[PDB]
């Protein structure tokens, strides 16, 4: 049987709050090492890669390696029924068509048991050439979210450009045009440029990603010429949440 117990249930709540809007269906890969997930939106414009190492769990067991197809909308709803300090436990049989979620209230007197149904899914194989670390940006996750929200009012897309003055985000609309410039001096925002890069992206998806903001204090942006953008959030020494995004033209 599979059994994964997590003390900080907030993490799982936060995870699905991030995915549900970006992705509806997804397959959960389980192993002796931990929990992983990988799926692309219907438009294949974006890809998600989740990693949750077993060592992060208070109690972990996985006899047989699994691949659980799931409705993330249906699954996020169940996690609404969880509190931010409920110990969450996931449970399933070696041959599972259902997934069991158990929330333990900290009051030590309330225990919820939700059991959801799985779906048969067509998984995708990939496919990735490893990044040229042409331009990399470490900065507060909130600030990134703010930036994406601001320019979302201006236009439908953003132009990101690197230099050693720093990195720059630009949007344009019938209203006007706006440019936010970021410079390094800490320490905190950090810009490591090896080459000047310049690409365009859709703000819609960036605004989806930023709902993963609560997971990390910082966000990382790996950018390379004519290859998809990478947006990474670390998950408290438990793993990482990685967003891939395809540019335009």
């Amino acid at each position: 049987m599979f059994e994964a117990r997590l003390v900080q249930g907030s993490i799982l709540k936060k995870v699905l709050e991030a995915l549900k809007d970006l992705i509806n269906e997804a397959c959960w890969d389980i192993s002796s090492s931990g929990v992983n997930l990988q799926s692309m939106d219907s438009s294949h414009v974006s890809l998600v890669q989740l990693t949750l190492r077993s060592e992060g769990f208070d109690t972990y067991r996985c006899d047989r390696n699994l691949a659980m197809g799931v409705n993330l909308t249906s699954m996020s709803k169940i996690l609404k029924c969880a509190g931010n300090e409920d110990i969450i436990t996931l449970r399933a049989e070696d041959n599972a068509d259902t997934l069991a979620l158990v929330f333990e209230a900290p009051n030590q007197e309330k225990v919820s048991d939700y059991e959801m149904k799985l779906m048969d899914l067509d998984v995708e194989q990939l496919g990735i050439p490893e990044q040229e670390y042409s331009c990399v940006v470490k900065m507060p996750s909130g600030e990134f979210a703010r930036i994406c929200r601001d320019l979302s009012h201006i236009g439908d897309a953003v132009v990101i450009s690197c230099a050693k003055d720093g990195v720059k985000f630009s949007a344009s609309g019938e209203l006007g045009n706006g440019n936010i410039k970021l410079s390094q001096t800490s320490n905190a925002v950090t810009i490591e440029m090896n080459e000047p890069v310049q690409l365009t992206f859709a703000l819609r998806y960036l605004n989806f990603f930023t709902k993963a903001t609560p997971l990390s204090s910082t966000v990382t942006l790996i950018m390379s010429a004519d290859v998809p953008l990478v947006v990474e959030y670390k998950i408290a020494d438990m793993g990482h949440l990685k967003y891939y995004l395809a540019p335009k033209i």
Binding site: S46, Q125, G127, A246
Partner: peptide, 14 residues
């Protein structure tokens, strides 16, 4: 000008 898809950059099969 036109939104790209990851299949154009990554190798996708299923």
């Amino acid at each position: 000008s036109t939104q790209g898809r990851l299949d154009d950059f990554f190798k996708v099969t299923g």
